[PDB]
């Protein structure tokens, strides 16, 4: 029958167009992919002044709120902190959340099994006028974290300027690319701010813009802390010029339930010697966690992939025709 | 032929059952796989007090033995240290491991090519009563690390509490998950220790338990340093509810030969100004290296993968039937 | 026909040799692959003395130029720095690049929108004899980074010694390997330096050698900063003995445009209390960025992969015969 032959030729044409227009065009079968090597260097340029009761004005420059000062990919930008000044080792009362004692016999000398704050001397001393806590041996100025300021201390960090410099290189093709594309120039970086539509190539990112693009409010996030994920994808075709190679920035919001362990926080201390006595300043820093992950691939024409793909296509076409014949006659 | 037909029916049934069950359900062919974006937050809550000879009791807290303040995937917990207090830059004797001089003519003005300890002035000064070393310019108190304390100074760091906060999100499926699963509540985190048999979901990990689960004894690993690797896997089946997916924690121990480079150690210093003179304290810290690696895969039903797998199965089935016929023919 | 039979036999033997030698032996189809986990430990043994105008001789040791104290995969080695000493918070003039004022009416009280240096009081004060800058609130000794010393302050860091400790393990096969191979003994590390041909397994890497093998001159990188990528690959066959497993060390140079953001730079501060007043030292460090990435794969014989490869090979063989027959029919 002529109709059977027409259907067979239609199936043959369909599979013959499919194999090429998919593997070669859509999937880039003739190209070869290699993993890149990336190093992320970040620089923060902004200032936030925090004034606390009983203390003088505090200046927080880049070195302050950026704790990974060595330009690590994963960095934390300080937005709120609790400061305990002039901590010195000695005999003093512990925190009330650790334990509450009504008499000296209640306290037991030794180390706490869980959440240890200090070596208990064995006496019950008044933490304040109302309650009494067991005396411990440690930094005497207590780190009270029960009161967290509702307005963020470093609330100016919302609309700061964040510079991200990423250099990627493909070892297979020996091609090195950087996020500073040829479209970006020196005068451009002076005033540009990153935008998904307006300024996609501008390497200067606003912290508030980055947080809002991830889906999180900066005000609520700055109080308790947060995690923001930044991904840079390098998808380019090496058959074209290297000018077309441009990085794509995607912001992902890493958050969780506020009822259980809200925000991100950590503690660091600055050790100094004053009046011949070793003292330190303890800060419970509530800051946003920024993680930068770079992944990408580059494709360039090669004979071996093209040949293998041609062979696979022939095999698919041959199998399809034989299978069609089995369907037609059985 | 009847037997040929029976063999063909059997082969067809076998290959059909295979292509319908294995690749479809066992391999999750109908589902699509994607990656996740992860960020690890670690917190150490523990207290260790060391009483070095000739010094006062030293208290170590979270800011002390956790050298990464913000908290990275790779962090070191201090277990043993060698302290060289009050280092000042001047002309003084070097360490005997560098070289031993019997006369002043032996020393040469310059710097050593390998393992340089300072700028040699060309003079031979007695390091102690017995031997003499060439005078160098630098920190006069040399870190004498020939003697390592047999009992770990921070031996209490064995059964401390370690909390790991991991937030993973899949971009294509827009699903965000955290290690704090629905089963874990606020009261649960108050009193729980990670036990793979009893408490697999408890996010609080005991350091000694983590070290023992890696195949290493904590005492020798602490007195000399070591490396412990922790992996978190997120295998989720998005066809079910999100509560079904739970993180799986695996502890792998990274160890080497004790004869060559035993354990892990590093050098850090704290700079201070006392009596108008710049001084520092040098610590040779022997600590366990903890690395957190998070990798996961999620699969959800989709029409395109299902269709491709069905088509592939038909092709495999078709090839198998043709092959069976050829085998029967010959 | 005889020639048709010869062509058929030739195609048969060709596809047989292919399926038996390429996908089985050359590609190790019978083996199975599993990813490894790695933790990198780095240690620098070098000393550089920098003499600056006004300040005394400054001695820099391992703890100094290596800012990551514990030691991560990404670390910075200080090669050049700009030191601003005795920074104290107060009302004082800003940098000329931030803004130049000719009258007090020009300055406006507030903070700069971009690249803020301090809180402008609103009075134009002379920065020096010629120009005047608006008075700001912050660290009064301003970092004047316009003048970069042409000779690197730390140029001796070229031919220093760098030791990399990498411990890898495969969880599937429970085999742990370290970069210290059995050929590397204790006496070997004392007198070996890494080379591509001479000492491929020596774990001591010269910084200048690493920089030069990446295609970069050490002086240009020491002047304005640099980024160097190190990759350690673990390609071994677990069918052989573990002694054959040897890591491969190669260095990748992440080049950057000289006119736009040359090199890598960062800023850190050391806080100290002197004479009861809080002061700090600000350093703008132009240090080379060293990134270490480990990617390895191990293969061991298994029955399931061997069977699948045999089956796939038979399928390819069958398809080829059918295709050949179709061509003969045509
Ligand atoms: N966080 C940032 N916000 C805005 N601009 C930045 C930021 N980081 C860098 N830049 C600009 O990018 C250009 C190149 O930066 P580079 O790494 O050379 O720093 P630099 O110019 O050496 O240091 P500085 O900016 O302190 O002079 C500089 O002109 C700088 O003004
Ligand atoms: N390493 C740890 N060991 C034991 N419990 C921990 C640890 N880290 C956090 N937790 C507990 O988990 C709960 C939620 O964690 P969260 O991030 O709120 O800590 P936190 O309350 O800020 O720390 P802290 O209890 O020191 O004030 C807290 O009540 C805390 O006590
Ligand atoms: N960066 C380096 N350059 C040259 N040799 C090194 C380097 N790091 C380590 N070594 C050598 O490797 C040997 C073993 O190092 P290991 O990790 O045991 O340090 P250590 O001997 O405990 O401490 P240190 O080497 O600081 O005295 C040492 O004898 C040392 O000489
Ligand atoms: C004393 O401290 C406890 C701690 O919980 C607090 O509840 C109480 O109000 C304090 N009393 C005074 C008088 O400050
Ligand atoms: C937002 O950016 C503007 C820049 O025009 C700045 O004036 C403002 O202070 C920023 N907001 C916060 C909360 O810092
Ligand atoms: C600077 O870069 C921008 C990119 O948006 C471009 O439009 C502009 O022409 C560039 N300036 C010069 C002087 O080339
Ligand atoms: C002097 O130092 C050397 C260094 O190895 C040591 O061997 C020797 O015992 C020391 N002598 C005394 C008396 O401490
Ligand atoms: C082990 O844990 C127990 C908790 O009951 C604690 O008392 C003990 O001190 C721990 N061991 C060490 C060596 O710290
Ligand atoms: C707390 O979590 C545990 C998980 O093991 C659960 O058994 C317990 O019921 C939870 N407590 C409450 C009050 O829900
Ligand atoms: C004052 O500082 C400016 C800053 O650009 C500089 O150009 C000028 O030469 C300086 N004048 C003197 C006398 O140092
Ligand atoms: C290069 O290495 C040699 C070792 O013989 C050393 O003397 C020299 O100072 C090194 N060069 C630099 C610039 O440090
Ligand atoms: C030390 O290692 C080297 C590796 O190059 C080897 O040639 C030498 O024989 C080893 N020394 C001893 C004493 O085994
Ligand atoms: Ca650090
Ligand atoms: Ca890291
Ligand atoms: Ca096929
Ligand atoms: Ca001080
Ligand atoms: Mg608390
Ligand atoms: Mg030593
Ligand atoms: Mg500048």
Sequence-ordered SSE layout with sheet pairings:
The structure is a homotrimer of 330-residue chains.
Chain A: H1 2-26, E1 31-35, E2 37-45, E3 48-50, E4 58-60, H2 62-65, E5 75-87, E6 89-93, E7 119-126, E8 132-139, E9 161-170, E10 175-178, H3 186-191, E11 204-206, H4 207-214, H5 218-224, E12 226-237, E13 248-254, E14 265-274, E15 277-301, H6 303-328
Parallel strand pairs in A: 12-15
Antiparallel strand pairs in A: 1-15, 2-9, 3-4, 5-15, 6-8, 7-8, 9-10, 9-11, 12-13, 14-15
Helix pairs in contact in A: 1-6
Bound molecules: adenosine-5'-triphosphate (ATP) (3 copies), 2-acetamido-2-deoxy-beta-D-glucopyranose (9 copies), calcium ion (4 copies) and magnesium ion (3 copies).
PDB class: transport protein
Keywords: ion channel, transport protein
Assembly: trimeric
Characterization of this structure:
The structure is a homotrimer of 330-residue chains. By secondary structure, chain A is α+β, with helices and mostly antiparallel strands. Chain A folds into three domains: 2-30 and 302-328, atp-gated p2x4 ion channel (Helix Hairpins); 35-85 and 156-299, Sandwich (atp-gated p2x4 ion channel fold), CATH 2.60.490.10; 89-140, no CATH class. In chain A, 23% of the residues lie in helices and 38% in strands. Chain A has six helices and 15 strands. Chain A has helices spanning 2-26, 62-65, 186-191, 207-214, 218-224, 303-328; strands at 31-35, 37-45, 48-50, 58-60, 75-87, 89-93, 119-126, 132-139, 161-170, 175-178, 204-206, 226-237, 248-254, 265-274, 277-301. In chain A, the strands form four sheets. In chain A, strands 1, 5, 12, 13, 14 and 15 form a six-stranded mixed beta sheet that branches. In chain A, α1 runs antiparallel to α6 (303-328). Chain A is elongated and about 105 Å long. At the A-B interface, β8, β12, β13, β14 and β15 of A face β2, β4, α2, β10 and β15 of B. The site of one 2-acetamido-2-deoxy-beta-D-glucopyranose (NAG) has 6 residues of chain A, from loops. One 2-acetamido-2-deoxy-beta-D-glucopyranose binds at residues 183-185, 187-188 of chain A.
């Amino acid at each position: 029958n002529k109709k059977v032959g027409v259907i067979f030729r239609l199936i043959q044409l369909v599979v013959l167009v499919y194999v090429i227009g998919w593997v070669f065009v859509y999937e880039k079968g003739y190209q070869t992919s290699s993993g890149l090597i990336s190093s992320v260097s970040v620089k923060l340029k902004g200032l936030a002044v925090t004034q606390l009761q009983g203390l003088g004005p505090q200046v927080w420059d880049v070195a302050d709120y950026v704790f990974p000062a060595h330009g690590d990919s994963s960095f934390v930008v300080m937005t709120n902190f609790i400061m305990t000044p002039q901590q010195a080792q000695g005999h003093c009362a512990e925190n009330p959340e650790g334990g509450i004692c009504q008499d000296d016999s209640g306290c037991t000398p030794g180390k706490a099994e869980r959440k240890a704050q200090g070596i208990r001397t064995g006496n019950c001393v008044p933490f304040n006028g109302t309650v009494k806590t067991c005396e411990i041996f440690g930094w005497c100025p207590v780190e009270v974290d029960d009161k967290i300021p509702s307005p963020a201390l470093l609330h100016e960090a919302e609309n700061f300027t964040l510079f991200i410099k990423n250099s990627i290189s493909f070892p297979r093709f020996k091609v090195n690319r950087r996020n500073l594309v040829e479209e970006v120039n020196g005068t451009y970086m002076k005033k540009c701010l990153y935008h998904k539509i307006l300024h996609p190539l501008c390497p200067v990112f606003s912290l508030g813009y980055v947080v809002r693009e991830s889906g999180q409010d900066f005000r609520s996030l700055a109080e308790k802390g947060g995690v923001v994920g930044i991904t840079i994808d390098w998808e380019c075709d090496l058959d074209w010029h290297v000018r077309h190679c441009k990085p794509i920035y995607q912001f992902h919001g890493l958050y969780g339930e506020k009822n259980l362990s809200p925000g991100f926080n950590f503690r660091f201390a600055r050790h100094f010697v004053q009046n011949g006595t070793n003292r330190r300043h303890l800060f419970k820093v509530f800051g946003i966690r920024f993680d930068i992950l770079v992944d990408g691939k580059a494709g360039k024409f090669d004979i071996i992939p093209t040949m293998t793909t041609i062979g696979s296509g022939i095999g698919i076409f041959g199998v399809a025709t034989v299978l069609c014949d089995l369907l037609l006659l059985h």
